[PDB]
């Protein structure tokens, strides 16, 4: 094992590889969400932009995890990336619900890795997750909750008009 | 025939003259659409601007075809320009449907000329159409499809209010 | 099928989805190559940068194909992404050989799609591939051939020293 | 004891004094390494600069620990500083191996203090170490591992030439 590796368990090394797979799967789900909203029969440019930006954020998350794996002397192992759960994502409301479920799953994977690091007494891992992931995930989930509330308030009223207004006046 | 003319069939020369007529007819249709939306009893400035800009694009298309006709040593022949199909264009939805039908007809005329150029082994014509027309037409048809979807989503909800919002928040 | 779709075969639509999968698989292979070269026991920063930049290029290729799919009124369909062919990539020479084999496979997939577009008389597809893919692929394969020649000239001489010099004086 | 001291154990206070001694000992070792590489019969300016910069980093580490000791109301106690382990440091490879062993020892002292802070429920200490020391130490050890790999690849090939090239083309 590495000349540099110190206090870095095989359990954390494997969990980090699994977390990379989860973040790349999430990036791929957001790519599908973004292009769905660019369809000529869906055509919500602000929604497409919101999800394409999240695809980039999740890929950057995966890349940060891979850099950290190499800095600790672990070995990156890539697995197949499962396709997204849907081919078509319904309304803006349906899509934002699917996104908040996906973010909560990433959050729970972060909290599980944090607990593993704590059990393995790995403060560099705990610091890394706290610094680069946990606060960003909480902020993103809160933003998605705010969006869900605003979408629901609008499409209860008058569904097509409310989806247009949310895209025009909240998203860009 | 020209001192410059080389590999330029009489079939392509005639089809180019017909395509100029189609583009000028389209420019004239967009002029009528634009001024309809400027009527005091229609009054959708963003819609008028959208169609007036397309009138200019179609005239520029015709002018590019005429320049190319002279560059190849063909002879421009102008015919009567038929008036537009309607005097009044209904709602924004009606108008955008009429526009996408007109763009699909220009697209099919481009594809027909491309096929003629291919049959006549005229790669300069094929390159000209690919470079200046085919991609612009696909992009425009996609934009009109996106508009149709957004208009339909809005005027299903509440017709007059939805037409106002589309003009204010999408068009300018 | 789409309000916008015109002259866009189901055969091309499916081949475009397959080509997106190939480009995303290639992006993933380049991500693995890049992080392999960042390992503390490999440590060739210029090589890691070369492959990470190609990971971004291949993802941008996939995104361009998806935009084009929507512009033509086709429907993006995502499949599972197969993991890369290796977990460890050997020397710079081994890696550059694996990269040129992967680029030739993408090139052959582009040429196959071009031939399908030609058989289906789809000049917009032929133009799209010629404009955004075919010349970039030829230029990249030539650059990789130049690299392979320089690496082979260096590591024939004195393997570790030659790999260091190539990374320091050609790559960045 | 201090008017300001709160939740700051005598065990942590003593361990912080010991850690200051370790960091100043490391600074002194890097001073000796730097001046060894400036000898007219060694003469590797980039290597001398690398170690002199680390001498400054380790002294800054000690100074940060002393500031923190006073901020918590502990009392700085200075002990004799042991001379470095060698008077002459051999090749660049020998020196970089000695440096990575010294950094791993500082890292293990940081992890031991983190574990003590955790046992004493001292989150300010845990935060201080995570913020200013743990990530810097991991990044430095990874950089030294990368250097060791590159030096070994070069001096396996042709020892004197490889040491020159590493100094000229990696270090400055
Ligand atoms: Cl372990
Ligand atoms: Cl002829
Ligand atoms: Cl078909
Ligand atoms: Cl105490
Ligand atoms: Na370890
Ligand atoms: Na769980
Ligand atoms: Na937002
Ligand atoms: Na001719
Ligand atoms: Na026809
Ligand atoms: Na527009
Ligand atoms: Na079609
Ligand atoms: Na083939
Ligand atoms: Na290059
Ligand atoms: Na205390
Ligand atoms: Na210990
Ligand atoms: Na350095």
Numbering used by the authors:
A (entry chain A), B (entry chain A), C (entry chain A), D (entry chain A): 1 to 172
Tell me, in the authors' exact words, what the paper reports.
Protein nanocages attracted intense attention as drug delivery systems due to their high biocompatibility, high solubility, and ease of surface modification. Among proteins, a special position is occupied by the ferritin superfamily since it has been shown that these proteins can selectively deliver anticancer drugs to cancer cells. Arsenoplatin-1 ([Pt(µ-NHC(CH3)O)2ClAs(OH)2]), also called AP-1, is the most representative member of this class. As the ferritin (Ft) nanocage has already been used to encapsulate a variety of metallodrugs, we explore here whether it is an appropriate nanocarrier for AP-1.
The AP-1-encapsulated horse spleen apo-ferritin (AFt) was prepared following the alkaline pH procedure previously reported for cisplatin-encapsulated AFt. Briefly, the protein cage is disassembled at basic pH and then reassembled in the presence of a large amount of the metallodrug (a protein subunit to AP-1 molar ratio of 1:50 was used). AP-1-encapsulated AFt was then crystallized and X-ray diffraction data on these crystals were collected at 1.50 Å at high resolution at ESRF synchrotron in Grenoble, France. Root mean square deviation between the carbon alpha atoms of each protein chain is as low as 0.13 Å. The Pt(II) center coordinates the ND1 atom of the histidine side chain; the Pt-ND1 distance is 2.5 Å. The AP-1 fragment forms hydrogen bonds with the side chain of Glu53 and with solvent molecules. Since more than one molecule of AP-1 per AFt chain is present, analysis of the protein structure points out that there are a lot of free AP-1 molecules trapped within the bulk.
